[PDB]
A paper describes a structure:
Central to the replication cycle of influenza viruses is the viral RNA-dependent RNA polymerase which transcribes and replicates the viral RNA genome. The influenza virus RNA-dependent RNA polymerase is a heterotrimeric multifunctional machine composed of polymerase basic 1 (PB1), polymerase basic 2 (PB2) and polymerase acidic (PA) subunits, that catalyzes both primer-independent replication (vRNA to complementary RNA (cRNA) and cRNA to vRNA synthesis) and primer-dependent transcription (vRNA to mRNA synthesis) in the nucleus of infected cells. PB1 houses the polymerase active site, whereas PB2 and PA contain, respectively, cap-binding and endonuclease domains required for transcription initiation by cap-snatching. High-resolution structures of the complete viral polymerase from a number of human, avian and bat influenza A viruses, as well as influenza B, C, and D viruses have been determined. These structures have revealed that the polymerase is a highly flexible macromolecule that can assume a variety of distinct conformations, enabling the polymerase to perform both transcription and replication that require different initiation and termination mechanisms.
Nb8207 binds to a unique position, termed site 3, at the product exit channel contacting both PB1 and the N-terminal region of PB2. To assess the inhibitory effect of nanobodies on polymerase activity, we performed an in vitro polymerase activity assay using recombinant RNP complexes derived from the 1918 pandemic influenza virus. β-globin mRNA was added to the vRNPs to facilitate primer-dependent transcription, in the presence of an excess of purified nanobody. These assays showed that a subset of nanobodies significantly inhibit transcription and/or vRNA to cRNA replication with Nb8207 being particularly potent. Nb8190, Nb8191, Nb8192, and Nb8207 caused a significant reduction in viral titre at most time points tested. Nb8190, Nb8191, Nb8192 and Nb8207 were shown to significantly inhibit viral mRNA synthesis. The site bound by Nb8207, one of the most potent nanobodies identified in our study, is located at the product exit channel, formed by PB1 and the N-terminal region of PB2. Binding of a nanobody at this site inhibits RNA production in both transcription and replication without affecting other polymerase activities such as CTD binding. We speculate that nanobody binding could inhibit RNA exit by blocking the product exit channel or might prevent the polymerase from assuming an active conformation as binding of a nanobody at this site is incompatible with the packing of the C-terminal domains of PB2 in both transcriptase and replicase conformations.
Residue numbers in the entry:
A (entry chain F): 1 to 24, 33 to 50, 58 to 99, 116 to 126
B (entry chain A): 1 to 716
C (entry chain B): 1 to 185, 207 to 756
D (entry chain C): 1 to 249
The structure:
RNA sequence: GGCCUGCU
RNA sequence: AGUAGAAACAAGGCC
């Protein structure tokens, strides 16, 4: 038992910015309806999201960040952080 | 305080306590009261255990002195007084043999009557507290605990006291002796409370002495001490220093990219000089076969009898005479060696049973031919210094030689089909999976394609010759040995057949290093006249030994039949690698199977059968004066097999260097042909690196010529 | 028509048929004689790439040393070892900034390992230069000799059983006025301070054989035993650091290397938009080891170990301090021949300092003339740079720092670069909006490399568009392509023993099928050829044949005796049941149900006099030196049968003055066997403690006799006999 | 009896007595690895070169009293000349085959119980069912997978104590295993191998192999299961897939 | 002539 | 002579 707490998320307009943080490798995943869980970032990022999102960390106070720039209608979903065996609860992002 | 342990206690206990002191690594000069306390604990352990024996009954027999007998069993057997590893060894052994429970801490004694442990501890404080203290330290313990204290009192759970009371009177007399002897000493200002359980240490790795001065001489130029340099490093922070030096650095330090275009690459220059000679250990294109049509298998049979029987199958022997001399040796020696071989072959034919291996006489002829007693005798430098001729071994670049057209034709005919099957493969587990059936069908196709190939015949020849030579060298190190070149094939009709190319005489082979050379002399029959390509036979001596009549529509030819005789040499590494020539088959057919799989990944179906039967698709596998010629997949198989065989035959450092430095340029050219805007930083350097590998090896020069032709045909 | 295989590349791309360009079916090049010429050439080349440095003379060793650090900046593209301290410190600082907490963590785990490491870890190494005899010997032998000499001289801290204590004793030995060594011809010889310093700072040079891919031979070096502990700790730190860097590829295997290369190329190209162009450079570094100054490694480690306990910093700094003053033994020597008098002679290399130059050719004459000033006591000072990749991991760290220094946050320009570095080789993917941007990026990368003492080989490097490149004989063309020509040399009999060779061959076929995309039919052909060679090598033919050998008679009688002949092993002249489906099963277990119980029992009999097992490490581990790579170990599945014998040893020690080593070997092995019979766990877990042999053995005899009576065969008569025999050996050890 | 007797015989001679006295337990490993024999650089070359000699292998001295010096025709089986740095004697390879045709026989029924991994592999393959081969491009992606299919969820050190307590119960020392999974494993492998006389070292090695989890990075396409990775060479190829179901499932 | 070694 | 190629083999040492 180590546990993860997402912060960030909210409603945001198309083309605008958000900062996610995950307090506690490290990754971010997202899930909508219709489809499934989708890999976002681990630095490594799935192709659909490159240049738009920056995953970063700060070891010093146990936090991983996702900077999300140039957001789109398709970027609406629950964002989860994970770690290696563990997940957080989530925060919904609505573009 | 240590004077007390100097005075009273016996040596045995004091050195036992000193080793226990060394055990946990603390020093005795800082706190000694622990030493005295635990040595008294150890003393009570002894005095409580000793003088107590048992016999086959219980009811321990107590004797002040053990009498000479088998009855020396000890009532209580000690735990402490040993290292932790052995203390736990005894604990585990007792638990596994007595079926008792394993304690988590160290006991002090074991007893049989009650079949259990004793943890003796005599503390300064009164018993009725220390007892339950150590009891709550030990979890759910059945080992009985018993403790004394200086006032003279005893206690125990179960009201149990395990042996005689006079022994306990002994214990407490010892105890008060200790007490009112410190009375004369006067230690209780700390004796009651002197240990509090201190465990701490700091690791110290100090640079000092000479090793420090060395540290002062391993710094940047403008530093004086390791202290100052470490302080500077700790105080250093990035303030844009790479940018300053990059700006200040001269601009001539650059990595400008030179575009690589179709007109950029130039043909590789080949060395010029005398034509290239033959280096193989046996004839490849000019071999001749004497046969018997026997039913024996490859390894089955005896060599000498088979060779003699094959040679008796030929009629037309003539007295041998010189045709083409060695040009550097003594050809009469070769002639006499050939006649000697014939004579001794007859000598074997006469006697009762053909020997499995024959040794030859060491005549002057083969003494010269095999290079015997020619190594300079090894001496000491102090005895040979004034000799003017004394110098290093000749160490220079090999002689330069230009390519000749014979290697090209030899490779051409090394890829041609034959009228025999030169591979008889072993057995495999019966195929059970469909993929195994596909693999077996593919393998059968490739075997049908490559078995009738001169490359396979060369593979078998080399493998057999090198195996026999290595075995003879390892067995008959001293004495010259005869080995007939034998290879067994199978005709189209299916009848098995043997073939005798000639003979090999192995010489002294006291091979210590992997590079040490064993010299032999090889004799091989042939029909190719050496008067047409003399430069290819620089190191051979060729005689005329007979005439052969092969059925032809032009009456019958009645061709001459010559003997190529030469002195050659090999080494343990060369023999070992030449006896693994069968992996050329692997290399080649792995390449072809990779081609087939890659093409079949496109069309979702196995594509082997149509490739091998329809023969619609073809690959560029050679160039004719008309242009580039393409052949079916089988011809590609044979060509790659021949390439691998020649790589294994003409192996040399030149080949490796050229292969690497030409694979680089091949990759660059492929990038150019793929429209990937290739670029180079120094192409002239790469060209010079490639051209320095081409010196005198026919195979590498032929590869370079092939590369030039490929460049000419490519880049269009 | 003339056949030409190379023309095949006109239809098949180069990488799809690159296996044809690997002549790995013939004997690889070998060196024949001394490696002294190569050693001298390497020393001179290393010293002349840093000629513009500053000269000094060490006050301890008295040897001339050349320091090029912070020297004049290069003005040409030739190799240069003039690394700048500030630039490298800044590069390490940026590496830390991009990966916060890397150095502190790595130092923490390294500190744990150093303070819990044992001395025996030094025995797990190949040949090392023993200075007690001035020659290369197995790591364990050299360690034992050095420990014996130290104990004879009074340095007995290593008795604590800790590697840190052994290093403490090693350093304390540096400050001794006179040590003593043993020589056999036994004679006790005295070594003064300077002589022992040079003997502890020296390296042994040899010639590398079985090196495929170059026309010329090279020289390699082996250090002593005093400096190997510091090297072990430094490499542990460097490995812990590199494991946290994704741009490094040295501490991983081949498949991981390919995966990381694919990931980096996809990351670089995919993130690049239509406007940005991408180019891959397949770079090799010329004279990689000769241009890496140990002082710079000292700087890197002291920056890494900032804000750490001073003892940790000292112990990690000792190694580069000794490398900066390292000496190299010239080599075996030189052999001369006189044809007029028909004789040969062998002069040791130590005479090169004083021997006249009339015997040497022009090239060797000039090499000796140039290297003589650096000769001190038969060895040449090699301060300027490393000899042969001893600090592989630190070099990889420096290269990774260079790679990361272009993350587009430090470039401050549109162009940027990334890639993968493995010492002496790298792939660099550089993206920029235009060809001018790519040119500027590559130029700046090259310039920054030249500021760190790292040179890029322009002759062995080329740049193309991303999608096609090479890295350590791995050819990437829109996806890695199998070669199978690098593993060809490993398809024969390994040479361990019969069962081991069979298992290793089948396992190698299996692995090359899994990794190197070996085809099914090709794998079957490989199995057939391997079985043929195996039978022809071990004289174990099918048994139903008439191939007369030295072993064909017993095999044939075993064949005729057996009823179910399908269960006989190929080693005993039985049929081969292996196939593509059975490549992962040991031979014994595949034929278990077919063997006759008599033959099965005779084969797998524990009491067989052939099977010998020494330690848990050497049970089923075989050391196969792969072609074009460093020595590697493989786990092979095998059942302990009567065929698991170990082969004969060299036996040439009997003609050398070092003949007493065999008697010591025999006595040590007898004592070790006795201890193992006393302590069965001696092999599986190496015993620890500070007591001596006889104490443990006698005391355990006491206890085991006791308890084995309390239930077992012993009797009172025997138990008392053992007790008094223990007393007898006690009083014997007393006197 | 015997053991202490050769101990006393060793201590009788001065050199071995000194070796036993001055050498501490920690140095055990060092002196045990103390040898003049270099590790071979080219094993294949010399194995192909040594096997052409007479008496190319080595065996314990006891072979001189179980196998006759010569066979029926007089081919020598063993020699009395000892190895370089050991008391073992050099013997011919025939002495191996001889041992397999007239040597002492035993009951090998327990080898299947010892070599659990290999026999489990054989049993799994014997009951496997193959399927059609499908030819299509396989996207082999590289992944970290566990190769050992019988790992009991234990690490090397974690199972090393279990192995000692199973084989060497007395040298365990302080450790007494807490996890109950280890308790049941110890009980089972103790009662199963209670009298097996193969060797303590090989038993420990095979227990380590069976129980300890091991992982390696491999190019896979599908599968990913432990049982499906041991046959990864047979089920997945460059352009073909062979459906397979081991006997376990 | 007799005997020793073949990675030391 | 031959093998081979930046240095070697074409037996070594011990009596």
């Amino acid at each position: 038992q180590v546990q993860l707490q997402e912060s960030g998320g909210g409603l945001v307009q198309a083309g605008a910015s958000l900062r996610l943080s995950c307090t506690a490798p490290m990754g971010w995943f997202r899930q909508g309806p219709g489809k499934e869980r989708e890999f976002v970032a681990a630095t490594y990022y799935g192709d659909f999201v490159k240049g738009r999102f920056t995953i970063s960390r700060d070891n010093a106070k146990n936090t991983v960040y996702l900077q999300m720039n140039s957001l789109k209608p398709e970027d609406t979903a629950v964002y989860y952080c994970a770690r290696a065996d563990y997940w957080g609860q989530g925060t919904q992002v609505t573009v | 305080m240590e004077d007390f342990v100097r005075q009273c206690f016996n040596p045995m206990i004091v050195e036992l306590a000193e080793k226990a002191m060394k055990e946990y690594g603390e020093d005795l000069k800082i706190e000694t009261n622990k030493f005295a306390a635990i040595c008294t604990h150890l003393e009570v352990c002894f005095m409580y255990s000793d003088f107590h024996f048992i016999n086959e009954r219980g009811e321990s027999i107590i004797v002040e002195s053990g009498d000479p007998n088998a009855l020396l069993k000890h009532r209580f057997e000690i735990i402490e007084g040993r290292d932790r590893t052995m203390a736990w060894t005894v604990v585990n052994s007792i638990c596994n043999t007595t079926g008792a429970e394993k304690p988590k801490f160290l006991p002090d004694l074991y007893d049989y009557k009650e079949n259990r442990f004793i943890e003796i501890g005599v503390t300064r404080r009164e018993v009725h507290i220390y007892y339950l203290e150590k009891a709550n330290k030990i979890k759910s313990e059945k080992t009985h605990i018993h403790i004394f204290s200086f006032t003279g009192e005893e206690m125990a759970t179960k009201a149990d006291y395990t042996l005689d009371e006079e022994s306990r009177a002994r214990i407490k007399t010892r105890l008060f002796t200790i007490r009112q002897e410190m009375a004369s000493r006067g230690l209780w200002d700390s004796f009651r409370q002197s240990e509090r359980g201190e465990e701490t240490i700091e690791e110290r790795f100090e640079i000092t002495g000479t090793m420090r001065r060395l540290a002062d001489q391993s710094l940047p130029p403008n530093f004086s001490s390791l202290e100052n340099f470490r302080a500077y490093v700790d105080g250093f922070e990035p303030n844009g220093y790479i940018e300053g030096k990059l700006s200040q650095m001269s601009k001539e330090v650059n990595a400008r990219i030179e575009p690589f275009l179709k007109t950029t690459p130039r043909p590789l220059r080949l060395p010029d000089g005398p034509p290239c000679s033959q280096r193989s250990k046996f004839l490849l294109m000019d071999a001749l076969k004497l046969s018997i049509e026997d039913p024996s298998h490859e390894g089955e049979g005896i060599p000498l009898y088979d060779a003699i029987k094959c040679m008796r199958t030929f009629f037309g022997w003539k007295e041998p005479n010189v045709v083409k001399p060695h040009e550097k040796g003594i050809n009469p020696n070769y002639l006499l060696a050939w006649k000697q071989v014939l004579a001794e072959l007859q000598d074997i034919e006469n006697e009762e049973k053909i020997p499995k291996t024959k040794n030859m006489k060491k005549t002057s002829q083969l003494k010269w031919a095999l290079g015997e007693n020619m190594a300079p005798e090894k001496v000491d430098f102090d005895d040979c210094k004034d000799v003017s001729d004394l110098k290093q071994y000749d160490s220079d670049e090999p002689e330069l030689r230009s390519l000749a057209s014979w290697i090209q034709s030899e490779f051409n005919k090394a890829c041609e089909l034959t009228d025999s099957s030169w591979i008889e493969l072993d057995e495999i587990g019966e195929d059970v999976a469909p993929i195994e059936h596909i693999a077996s069908m593919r393998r059968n196709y490739f075997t049908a394609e490559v078995s009738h190939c001169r490359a396979t015949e060369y593979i078998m020849k080399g493998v057999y010759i090198n195996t026999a030579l290595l075995n003879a060298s390892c067995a008959a190190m001293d004495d010259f040995q005869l080995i007939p070149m034998i290879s067994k094939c199978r005709t189209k009709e299916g009848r098995r057949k043997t073939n005798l190319y000639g003979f090999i005489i192995k010489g002294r082979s006291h091979l210590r290093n992997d590079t040490d050379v064993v010299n032999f002399v090889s004799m091989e029959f042939s029909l190719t006249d050496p008067r047409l390509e003399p430069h290819k036979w620089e190191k051979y001596c060729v005689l005329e030994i007979g005439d052969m009549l092969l059925r032809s529509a032009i009456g019958q030819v009645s061709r001459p039949m010559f003997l190529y005789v030469r002195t050659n040499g090999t080494s343990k590494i060369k023999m070992k690698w030449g006896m693994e020539m069968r992996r050329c088959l692997l290399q080649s057919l792995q390449q072809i199977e990779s081609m087939i799989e890659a093409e079949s990944s496109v069309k979702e179906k196995d594509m082997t059968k149509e490739f091998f039967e329809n023969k619609s698709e073809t690959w560029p596998i050679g160039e004719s004066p008309k242009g580039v010629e393409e052949g079916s997949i089988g011809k590609v198989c044979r060509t790659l097999l021949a390439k691998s065989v020649f790589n294994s035959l003409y192996a040399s450092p030149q080949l490796e260097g050229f292969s690497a430095e030409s694979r680089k340029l091949l990759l660059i050219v492929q990038a150019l042909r793929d429209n990937l805007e290739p670029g180079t930083f120094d192409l002239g350097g790469l060209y010079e690196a490639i051209e320095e590998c081409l010196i005198n090896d026919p195979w590498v020069l032929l590869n370079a010529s092939w590369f030039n032709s490929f460049l000419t045909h490519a880049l269009r | 028509m003339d056949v030409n295989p190379t023309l095949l590349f006109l239809k098949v791309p180069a990488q799809n048929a690159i296996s044809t360009t690997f002549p790995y079916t013939g004997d690889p090049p070998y060196s024949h004689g001394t490696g002294t010429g190569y050693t001298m050439d390497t020393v001179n080349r290393t010293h002349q790439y840093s000629e513009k440095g500053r000269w000094t003379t060490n006050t301890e060793t008295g040897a001339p040393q050349l320091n090029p650090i912070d020297g004049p900046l290069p003005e040409d593209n030739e190799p240069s070892g003039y690394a700048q301290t500030d630039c490298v410190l800044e590069a390490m600082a940026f590496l830390e900034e991009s990966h916060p907490g890397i150095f502190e963590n790595s130092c923490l785990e390294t500190m744990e390992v150093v303070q819990q490491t044992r001395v025996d870890k030094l025995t797990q190494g190949r040949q090392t230069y023993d200075w007690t005899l001035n020659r290369n010997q197995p790591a364990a032998t050299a360690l034992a000799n050095t420990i014996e000499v130290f104990r004879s001289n009074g340095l007995t801290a290593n008795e604590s059983g800790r590697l840190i204590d052994f290093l403490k004793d090693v350093m304390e030995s540096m400050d001794k006025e006179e040590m003593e060594i043993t020589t056999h011809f036994k004679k006790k010889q005295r070594l003064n301070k300077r002589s022992y310093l040079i003997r502890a700072l020296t390296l042994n040079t040899m010639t590398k054989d079985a090196e495929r891919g170059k026309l010329k031979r090279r020289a390699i070096a082996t250090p002593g035993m005093q400096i190997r502990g510091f090297v072990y700790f430094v490499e542990t730190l460097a490995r812990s650091i590199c494991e946290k860097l994704e741009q490094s590829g040295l501490p991983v295997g081949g498949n991981e290397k390919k995966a990381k290369l694919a990931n980096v190329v996809r990351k670089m190209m995919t993130n690049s938009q239509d406007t940005e162009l991408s180019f891959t450079i397949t770079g090799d570094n010329t004279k990689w080891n000769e241009n890496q100054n140990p002082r710079m490694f000292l700087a890197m480690i002291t920056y890494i170990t900032r804000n750490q306990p001073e003892w940790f910093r000292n112990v990690l700094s000792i190694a580069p301090i000794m490398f900066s003053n390292k000496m190299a033994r010239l080599g075996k020597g030189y052999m001369f021949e006189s044809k007029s008098m028909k004789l040969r002679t062998q002069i040791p290399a130590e005479m090169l300092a004083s021997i006249d130059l009339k015997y040497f050719n022009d090239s060797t004459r000039k090499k000796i003339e140039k290297i003589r000033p650096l000769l001190i006591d038969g060895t040449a000072s090699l301060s300027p740079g490393m000899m042969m990749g001893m600090f592989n991991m630190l070099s990889t760290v420096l290269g990774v720092s260079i790679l990361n220094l272009g993350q587009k946050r430090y470039t401050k320009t549109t162009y940027w670069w990334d890639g993968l570095q493995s010492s002496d080789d790298f792939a660099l993917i550089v993206n920029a909006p235009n060809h001018e941007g790519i040119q500027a990026g590559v130029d700046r990368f090259y310039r920054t490399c030249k500021l760190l003492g790292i040179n890029m080989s322009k002759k062995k490097s080329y740049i193309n568009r991303t999608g096609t490149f090479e890295f350590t004989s791995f050819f990437y063309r829109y996806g890695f392509v199998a070669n199978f020509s690098m593993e060809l040399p490993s398809f024969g009999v390994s040479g361990i023993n019969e069962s081991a060779d069979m298992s290793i061959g089948v396992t190698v076929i299996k692995n090359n099928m899994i990794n190197n995309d070996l085809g099914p039919a090709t794998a079957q052909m490989a199995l057939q050829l391997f079985i043929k060679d195996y039978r022809y090598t071990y004289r174990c033919h099918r048994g139903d044949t008439q191939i007369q050998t030295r072993r064909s008679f017993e095999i044939k009688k075993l064949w005729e005796q057996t009823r179910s002949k399908a269960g006989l092993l190929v080693s005993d002249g039985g049929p081969n049941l292996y196939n593509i489906r059975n490549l992962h099963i040991p031979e014994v277990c595949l034929k278990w149900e077919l063997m006759d119980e008599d033959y099965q029992g005779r084969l797998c009999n524990p009491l067989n006099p052939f099977v010998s097992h020494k330690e848990i490490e050497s049970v089923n581990n075989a050391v196969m030196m792969p072609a074009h790579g460093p020595a590697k170990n493989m786990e092979y599945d095998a059942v302990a049968t009567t065929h698991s014998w170990i082969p004969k040893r060299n036996r040439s020690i009997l003609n050398t003055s070092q003949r007493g080593i065999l008697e010591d070997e025999q006595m040590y092995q007898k004592c070790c066997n006795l201890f193992e019979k006393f302590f069965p766990s001696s092999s599986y877990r190496r015993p620890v403690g500070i007591s001596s042999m006889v104490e443990a053995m006698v005391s355990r005899a006491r206890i085991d006799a006791r308890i084995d009576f309390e239930s077992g065969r012993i009797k009172k008569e025997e138990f008392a006999e053992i007790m008094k025999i223990c007393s007898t050996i006690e009083e014997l050890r007393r006197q | 009896m015997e053991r202490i007797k050769e101990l006393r015989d060793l201590m009788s001679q001065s050199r071995t007595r000194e070796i036993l006295t001055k050498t501490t337990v920690d140095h055990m490993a060092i002196i045990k690895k103390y040898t003049s024999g270099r590790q071979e650089k080219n094993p294949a070359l010399r194995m192909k070169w040594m096997m052409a000699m007479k008496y190319p292998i080595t065996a314990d001295k006891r072979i001189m009293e179980m196998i006759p010096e010569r066979n029926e025709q007089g081919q020598t089986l063993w020699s009395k000349t000892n190895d370089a740095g050991s008391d073992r004697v050099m013997v011919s390879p025939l002495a191996v085959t001889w041992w397999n045709r007239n040597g002492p026989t035993t009951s090998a029924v327990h080898y299947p119980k010892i070599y659990k991994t290999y026999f489990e592999k054989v049993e799994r393959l014997k009951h496997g069912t193959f399927g059609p081969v499908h030819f299509r491009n396989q996207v082999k992606i590289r992944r970290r997978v566990d190769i050992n299919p019988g790992h009991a969820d234990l690490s090397a050190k974690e199972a090393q104590d279990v192995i000692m307590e199973v084989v060497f119960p007395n040298e365990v020392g302080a450790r007494i295993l807490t996890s109950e999974s280890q308790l049941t494993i110890t009980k089972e492998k103790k009662e199963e191998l209670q009298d097996c006389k193969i060797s303590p070292l090989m038993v420990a090695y095979m227990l380590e192999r069976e129980l300890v989890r091991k992982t390696r990075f491999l190019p896979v396409a599908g599968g990913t299961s432990s049982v499906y990775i041991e046959v990864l060479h047979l089920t997945q190829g460059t352009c073909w897939e062979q459906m397979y179901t081991p006997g376990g499932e």
